[PDB]
């Protein structure tokens, strides 16, 4: 069971080192390409794919972005729950909390319908 902060902390150094490695291999591919094209063939060695490098870099970047976004969403959820409901859970009777949530939803829907009828009357 890994945590968002833990996964972020373990992914950041992997991301940095992957960036370093991909930049090194890109520079190697570039100098090899120039030596074979501009000058004479001197780098008699096979280079790397060079596609997997930045591909996995972008993959880890997307992973980090989405997990940090999930953590932000969780914090926002907690904040909005604490603002729209008191901190009470098994203390508060669960059916009463469900009824209160249903009434809150109905009240919000009523306010929205009132504003919509208002806008329509403005039309």
């Amino acid at each position: 069971d890994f945590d968002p902060v833990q996964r972020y902390k373990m992914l950041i150094p992997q991301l940095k080192e992957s960036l370093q490695t991909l930049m090194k291999v890109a520079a190697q591919n570039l100098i090899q390409n120039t030596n074979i094209d501009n000058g004479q063939k001197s780098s008699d060695a096979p280079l790397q794919r060079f596609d997997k490098c930045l591909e996995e870099f972008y993959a880890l970047c997307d992973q980090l972005e989405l997990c940090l976004r999930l953590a932000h969403e969780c914090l926002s959820q907690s904040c909005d729950s604490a603002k729209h409901s008191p901190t009470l859970v098994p203390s508060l009777p669960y059916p009463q909390y469900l009824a209160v949530i249903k009434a809150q939803i109905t009240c919000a829907k009523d306010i929205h319908t009132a504003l919509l009828d208002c806008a329509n009357k403005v039309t």
Binding site: V5, F57, C61, S81, I101, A108
Partner: protein
């Protein structure tokens, strides 16, 4: 919970890192368009590395790190998912939360920019006052109290940190006739009108009267007394005087614009 702002900043930072990587690899995919004297545009390449140095800005997130590590399994949220599977219509609660927050911020910005009023004029309750005073007394280090010794008007006194207590007579609203007295107070048997000072606290009382005549609104006395209490509480330090030295005159106190500075500066 300001850590949400920190996580949003981190998201923006990593997205900027990705964008900078894309931009520098795209710039490397192009040469000198038209230099004709020197390919100095390669220096922009180095400048692009500066944006890659902005990756170290994401390392600044390690300072903002450790934002949330607790229990509280999602704060009383799971009702149908972790509860009644048949209860699928849950997300309506989150929808309502977002709707309410959006409405709140929208109306806040609207009221903030609606200061440009367009109404020319209007042409073709002691319990409430005590309740408003008690509600305003809800701020820390702002112990106030009232007694109403004489008259149906309100006699309110405030003592925040020092012996600089201030009295303000009210008429259920727009409390005028301010009198501040540093280190004595309620002589005789009730509030007094000595108004003695050290040629500076009297200036403070003048400032308070100017604010009262300035912060007077046509209606809604709640916002009026709230601004009054904030304006008075802003005097909790009296230790800094920008725009000049700390000794421009006898004393440097006048925060009428939400910031204290050297006196005699209008």
């Amino acid at each position: 919970g300001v850590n949400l702002e920190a996580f949003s900043q981190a998201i923006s930072a990593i997205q900027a890192l990705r964008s900078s990587v894309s931009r520098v690899f795209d710039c490397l995919k192009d040469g000198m368009r038209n230099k004709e004297t020197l390919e100095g545009r390669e220096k922009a390449f180095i400048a692009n590395f500066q944006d890659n140095l902005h990756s170290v800005n994401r390392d600044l997130n390690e300072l903002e790190r450790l934002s949330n590590l607790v229990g509280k399994p999602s704060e009383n949220h799971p009702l149908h998912n972790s509860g009644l599977l048949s209860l699928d219509p849950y997300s309506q609660l989150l929808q309502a939360y977002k709707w309410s927050n959006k409405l709140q911020y929208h109306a806040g910005l609207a009221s903030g920019l609606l200061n440009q009023q367009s109404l020319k004029r209007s042409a073709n309750p002691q319990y409430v006052d005590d309740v408003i005073s008690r509600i305003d007394r809800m701020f820390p280090e702002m112990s106030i109290h009232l007694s109403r010794p004489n008259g149906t008007s309100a006699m309110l006194l405030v003592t925040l940190g020092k012996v600089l207590k201030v009295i303000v007579v009210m008429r259920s609203l727009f409390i005028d006739r301010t009198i501040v007295k540093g280190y004595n107070t309620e002589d005789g048997k009730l509030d007094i009108w000595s108004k003695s000072s050290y040629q500076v606290f009297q200036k403070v009382t003048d400032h308070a009267t100017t604010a009262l005549l300035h912060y007077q609104l046509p209606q809604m006395p709640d916002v009026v007394v709230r601004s009054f209490m904030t304006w008075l509480r802003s005097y909790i330090k009296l230790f800094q005087a920008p725009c000049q030295r700390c000794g421009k005159f006898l004393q440097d106190g006048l925060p009428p614009t939400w910031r204290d500075f050297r006196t005699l500066e209008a």
